Design a protein around this ligand. Structure first.
Ligand SMILES: CC(=O)N[C@H]1[C@H]([C@H](O)[C@H](O)CO)O[C@@](O)(C(=O)O)C[C@@H]1O
Length: 502
C-alpha cells in the first residue's frame, strides 16, 4: 500500500538551514540529510549531489560533508564536541561527493557545511543557499523529502552564546544583555539544568562577558546556583547605575502562581563594581515590595512579584527602575504592573502607583522629550491581541494608558525596546515574535514618534522565536539577544538598522 511488503523501504529526509550566519565562521550547515535506517550491510558507497549558486559560492572558502550519529539542530561546532562528527572536505567548485559505507560506519545524518569568507555586504538579499539534488546508494538514487529551503542571512555578527548541553545544563532560557559605559557586554541567562520549565524547577543564573564588542566571549560562569526544586533562581534583569555599578535583579524559589504573602517567591539584587567579573551575594529585597515583612500594610497581603527579564532603565536623574508584575489576589491568575525604583543606588526600593491593570512582563524606555514609555506584554489574548503601552511624565511615578502607541501584535511574549534616531527621525525599535498567535519569527518594528505609525515587521530570525533583549553598542550597531528554536539556544546577533530596513 503506502507501506509495501516486499522489503525495507529506506526514506531520505532533507532540511535546508535558515539560521543566521556571520563572516569567517567555520563548518556552517547549509543542508542536513537524514536516512531513516543505516546503510544496509551490503552497501558500498553513498553519493550526494548538490547545487549551490555562484553568489553563495563567492561567499564561502570551503565545503564539507559532515557525518554524525546525532541529528543536531544547530551547527555542529555549536555543540563543542558533544556531537561527534567526521568532516570530509569538498572543493568549493565540486557539486558531488561520495563516501564508503565503512567511512559512514552505520551513521544516518549528513550535513553539507561551509566555511564563510570575509563577506563585505549585509543587505537583506545577502543570504547563502544550497540544495541537495541527489542521494544514491550503490549508484541507485533515493527519493528526497524536502522539508524547508536553505536561506542563511549574513549578519555583521551572529553567535549562539548558550546552547542546550553547554556546561552540562540540558537547556537555557531567558536572555539578558547589558552594555556598560566602558563598552563591556554582559550576557546572562537561566541555566535550566534538567529541562526547559520555569521556577519552581531547579535553575541557575549563568553569565558570559565580552570586552571586544561581542567578537569573543568568556567561558560561562554560574553566578547564582539553584539548590533544588523550590530553591532555584532566574528571570534576570540588568542595569548599570549612574555611579557605574552593575545591578542584577532576579527571583528565586517557588513558582509565580504558588507564591503567597507568607511563603513568597523572592526578589533579589546583586551588584558588580568591576564590569561583571565579581558579584555581591544576592540580597533579598522582597520586603520592599509585598508580603509578610512589607512595611506597607496595603501590600502585605499581595502574593507575588517579579521584574521582567532583560533590562531595566536608569533615568537621567539617576533613578533606577524595573517594572514589576504583581499578583494582588489569590482568587485570580492576574497581574498588575508597578514600577520598582530606587533613588539611592539600590539601598532602598519603592513602588510607583499602579501603571497597568491586568498586565504582565513590562519594559521601559526614555522618550526624546524625557517622558517614560512602558511596553506591557499582552497575557491571555486580551482585547485585539495587541501589545499594550503606557506613558509617564513624572519619571515613572504615575502612568496613563497610551493607545496611540498600540499597533503591533503581541502573541504573549517578552520583548525589548530601543530609542533610536534614523534619518533625523526619533523612533522606537521594538522586538517581538511576529507569530501570529505563536512564538515564531523573531521580528523588529520601528515606531515613528511624529507620525504615530509602526513599520512593517522585519524578521530577524525565522522559526521558533521567543524572548528577546536588545542593546545599543558604542559604534551604532544593535545587539539582539534572542531565544531561537523549540529547544532554545540564546543567540546574539549584531546589525545596523539599515541592514534590516533601508
Ligand atoms: C517568574 C516567571 O514565572 N517567569 C516566567 C514568565 C511568567 O510565567 C509569565 O510572564 C506570567 O504570565 O513567562 C514564561 O513562563 C514564558 O512565558 O516563557 C517564562 C518566565 O520564566
Amino acid at each position: 500500500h503506502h507501506h509495501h511488503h516486499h522489503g525495507s523501504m529506506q526514506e531520505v529526509t532533507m532540511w535546508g538551514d535558515s539560521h543566521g550566519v556571520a563572516p569567517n565562521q567555520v563548518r556552517r550547515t547549509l543542508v542536513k540529510v537524514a536516512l531513516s535506517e543505516s546503510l544496509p550491510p551490503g552497501a558500498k558507497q553513498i553519493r550526494i549531489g548538490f547545487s549551490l549558486p555562484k553568489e553563495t559560492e563567492e561567499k564561502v572558502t570551503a565545503l564539507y560533508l559532515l557525518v554524525s550519529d546525532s541529528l543536531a539542530v544547530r551547527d555542529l561546532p555549536d555543540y563543542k564536541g558533544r556531537v561527534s562528527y567526521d568532516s570530509f572536505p569538498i572543493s568549493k567548485e565540486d557539486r558531488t561527493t561520495a563516501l564508503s559505507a565503512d567511512s559512514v560506519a552505520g551513521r544516518r545524518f549528513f550535513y553539507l557545511a561551509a566555511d564563510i569568507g570575509p563577506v563585505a555586504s549585509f543587505s537583506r538579499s545577502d543570504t547563502l543557499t544550497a540544495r541537495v539534488e541527489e542521494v544514491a546508494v550503490d549508484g541507485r538514487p533515493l527519493p528526497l523529502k524536502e522539508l524547508s529551503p536553505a536561506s542563511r542571512r549574513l549578519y555583521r555578527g551572529y553567535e549562539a552564546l548558550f546552547v542546550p548541553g553547554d556546561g552540562g545544563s540540558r537547556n537555557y532560557r531567558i536572555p539578558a544583555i547589558l552594555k556598560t559605559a566602558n563598552g563591556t557586554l554582559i550576557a546572562m541567562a537561566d541555566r535550566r539544568k534538567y529541562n526547559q520549565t520555569d521556577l519552581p524547577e531547579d535553575i541557575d543564573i549563568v553569565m558570559r562577558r565580552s570586552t571586544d564588542g561581542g567578537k569573543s566571549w568568556s567561558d560561562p560562569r554560574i553566578i547564582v546556583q539553584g539548590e533544588g526544586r523550590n530553591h532555584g533562581f532566574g528571570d534576570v534583569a540588568l542595569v548599570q547605575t549612574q555611579a557605574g555599578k552593575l545591578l542584577m535583579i532576579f527571583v528565586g524559589g517557588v513558582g509565580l502562581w504558588q507564591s503567597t504573602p507568607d511563603r513568597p517567591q523572592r526578589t533579589y539584587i546583586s551588584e558588580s563594581r568591576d564590569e561583571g567579573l565579581t558579584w555581591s551575594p544576592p540580597r533579598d529585597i522582597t520586603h520592599f515590595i509585598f508580603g509578610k515583612d512589607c512595611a506597607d500594610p496595603g501590600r502585605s497581603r499581595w502574593l507575588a512579584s517579579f521584574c521582567a527579564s532583560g533590562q531595566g532603565l536608569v533615568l537621567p536623574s539617576g533613578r533606577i527602575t524595573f517594572v514589576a508584575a504583581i499578583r494582588e489576589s489569590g482568587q485570580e491568575y492576574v497581574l498588575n504592573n508597578y514600577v520598582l525604583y530606587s533613588d539611592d543606588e539600590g539601598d532602598t526600593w519603592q513602588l510607583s502607583d499602579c501603571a497597568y491593570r491586568r498586565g504582565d512582563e513590562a519594559k521601559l524606555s526614555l522618550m526624546p522629550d524625557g517622558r517614560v514609555l512602558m511596553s506591557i506584554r499582552n497575557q491571555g489574548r486580551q482585547e485585539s491581541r495587541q501589545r499594550f503601552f503606557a506613558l509617564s511624565s513624572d519619571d515613572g511615578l504615575t502612568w496613563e494608558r497610551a493607545k496611540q502607541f498600540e499597533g503591533i501584535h503581541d502573541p504573549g511574549c517578552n520583548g525589548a525596546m530601543l530609542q533610536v534616531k534614523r534619518n533625523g527621525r526619533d523612533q522606537v525599535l521594538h522586538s517581538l515574535p511576529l507569530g501570529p498567535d505563536g512564538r515564531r519569527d523573531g521580528a523588529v518594528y520601528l515606531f515613528d514618534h511624529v507620525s504615530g505609525r509602526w513599520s512593517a515587521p522585519v524578521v530577524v530570525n525565522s522559526g521558533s522565536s521567543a524572548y528577546s533583549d536588545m542593546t545599543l553598542l558604542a559604534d551604532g550597531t544593535i545587539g539582539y539577544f534572542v531565544e531561537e528554536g523549540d529547544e532554545i539556544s540564546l543567540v546574539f546577533i549584531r546589525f545596523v538598522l539599515d541592514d534590516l530596513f533601508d
